[PDB]
Amino acid sequence: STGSATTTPIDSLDDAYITPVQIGTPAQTLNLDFDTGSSDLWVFSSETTASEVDGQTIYTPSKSTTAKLLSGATWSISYGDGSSSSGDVYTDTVSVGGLTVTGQAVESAKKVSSSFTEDSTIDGLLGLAFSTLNTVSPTQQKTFFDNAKASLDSPVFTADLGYHAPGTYNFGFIDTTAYTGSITYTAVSTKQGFWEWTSTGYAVGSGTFKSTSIDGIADTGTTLLYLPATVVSAYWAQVSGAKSSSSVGGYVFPCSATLPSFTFGVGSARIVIPGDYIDFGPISTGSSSCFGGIQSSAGIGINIFGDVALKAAFVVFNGATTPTLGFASK
Numbered sequence: 602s603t604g605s606a607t608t609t610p611i612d613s614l615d616d617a618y619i620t621p622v623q624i625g626t627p628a629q630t631l632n633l634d635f636d637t638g639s640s641d642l643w644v645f646s647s648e649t650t651a652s653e654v655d656g657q658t659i660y661t662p663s664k665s666t667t668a669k670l671l672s673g674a675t676w677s678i679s680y681g682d683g684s685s686s687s688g689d690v691y692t693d694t695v696s697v698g699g700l701t702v703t704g705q706a707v708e709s710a711k712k713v714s715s716s717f718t719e720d721s722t723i724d725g726l727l728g729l730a731f732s733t734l735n736t737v738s739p740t741q742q743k744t745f746f747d748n749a750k751a752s753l754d755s756p757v758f759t760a761d762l763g764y765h766a767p768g769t770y771n772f773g774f775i776d777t778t779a780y781t782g783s784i785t786y787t788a789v790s791t792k793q794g795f796w797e798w799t800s801t802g803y804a805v806g807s808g809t810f811k812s813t814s815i816d817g818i819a820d821t822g823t824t825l826l827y828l829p830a831t832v833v834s835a836y837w838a839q840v841s842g843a844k845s846s847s848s849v850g851g852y853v854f855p856c857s858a859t860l861p862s863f864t865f866g867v868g869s870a871r872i873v874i875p876g877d878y879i880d881f882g883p884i885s886t887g888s889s890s891c892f893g894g895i896q897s898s899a900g901i902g903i904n905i906f907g908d909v910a911l912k913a914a915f916v917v918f919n920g921a922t923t924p925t926l927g928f929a930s931k
């Protein structure tokens with residue numbers, strides 16, 4: 602089997618991407634944030650505290666003939682921005698782009714934090730990191746991808762995120778029409794539960810390439826590119842007037858700038874992020890200070906190849922017995 606679904610930016614800055622997902626019988630379609638940095642499939646639901654729902658579509662298990670309470674199971678998760686959610690668990694049929702999993706754990710939110718409530722466009726998350734990170738207790742649950750894997754034509758999924766445009770998540774096949782050149786594969790460590798790999802270095806604009814190992818994670822659920830302070834300082838030094846602002850919470854730059862590109866290495870291959878992808882617009886409405894899309898990872902504890910990086914590539918998440926990651930230009 603295979604599946605193919607379109608993923609769409611939630612706003613004009615590509616702050617996140619949503620993908621329609623069918624849950625239950627008859628289908629209830631929710632727009633979920635596919636997140637290769639976490640491992641829980643959770644939704645806004647008929648159980649979510651009413652004051653914490655503001656415009657989201659909710660899953661109502663009592664209207665699904667295939668829903669079953671997973672008795673005793675609870676979940677609770679926090680993300681890197683300090684947002685969080687928690688609740689109980691149902692099993693139900695879940696389909697993505699034509700690919701169906703029966704008995705998928707669907708984690709129903711009882712509580713969500715404010716930045717979820719405020720994100721009217723995101724109806725929940727669909728985790729695609731390794732199932733060892735799943736938060737369900739006392740019986741950890743499998744991700745949609747793990748449950749689907751044995752049925753897939755090939756044990757892979759791909760992310761093809763757009764810049765200010767829709768893109769695609771495919772399950773079970775590589776669309777050879779979706780990228781240019783060849784795919785370069787690189788080793789993955791699953792020791793921390795992430796799609797963790799080592800970039801071979803970087804360049805700023807038309808500058809020379811610096812060969813240096815940068816360990817980080819491929820994370821579709823993180824908006825920005827978070828890299829070591831040394832790398833990020835070298836980037837922003839090429840933008841007149843750019844500075845790190847502790848009041849704003851990162852590097853800002855004059856909205857009048859033309860940002861340089863940023864290149865990252867994948868083995869001997871190179872992925873170029875255009876300068877436009879690094880612009881996250883005014884820090885507040887009408888400001889002439891703009892927020893940067895490359896930020897320091899210092900104090901996060903991990904480097905994160907988030908959407909800014911991943912959208913510049915066609916990315917293969919290879920879930921074979923020994924997982925790997927592939928990147929192609931597009």
Ligand SMILES: Cc1nc(N)sc1-c1nccn1C
Pocket residue numbers: 617634636638639680681682684685716717720723726822823
């Ligand atoms: C910051 C973040 N990281 C994720 N993987 S979900 C999440 C999030 N918190 C609030 C809204 N959204 C989309």
Ligand SMILES: Cc1nc(N)sc1-c1nccn1C
Pocket residue numbers: 856858859860861875876877878880
């Ligand atoms: C700030 C910026 N740097 C580029 N290389 S294009 C760009 C920009 N200004 C306005 C819109 N966009 C995308």
